[PDB]
Nucleic acid binder design. Structure first.
Length: 49
DNA sequence: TGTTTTGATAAG
DNA sequence: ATCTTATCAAAAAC
């Protein structure tokens, strides 16, 4: 199996960024991961909260 | 001639 | 004119 594109530290970190209005397009670049991958790990439905 | 996640992309 | 979601070929590592 392929390796996850993001460890735990990055997740909650990205998680917090997304709850500040940071565009997923921005955080894909900074962390080097696909935008679509950001929607899977952090659905927009689980952030509005 | 053989599992797990990524990420482009169409669809809503 | 975006934002999101669901999908799925294929990469990546075994």
């Amino acid at each position: 199996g392929r390796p996850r594109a993001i460890n735990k530290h990055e997740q909650e970190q990205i998680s917090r960024l997304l709850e500040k209005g940071h565009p997923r397009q921005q955080l894909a670049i900074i962390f080097g991961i696909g935008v679509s991958t950001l929607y899977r790990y952090f659905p927009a439905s689980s952030i509005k909260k």
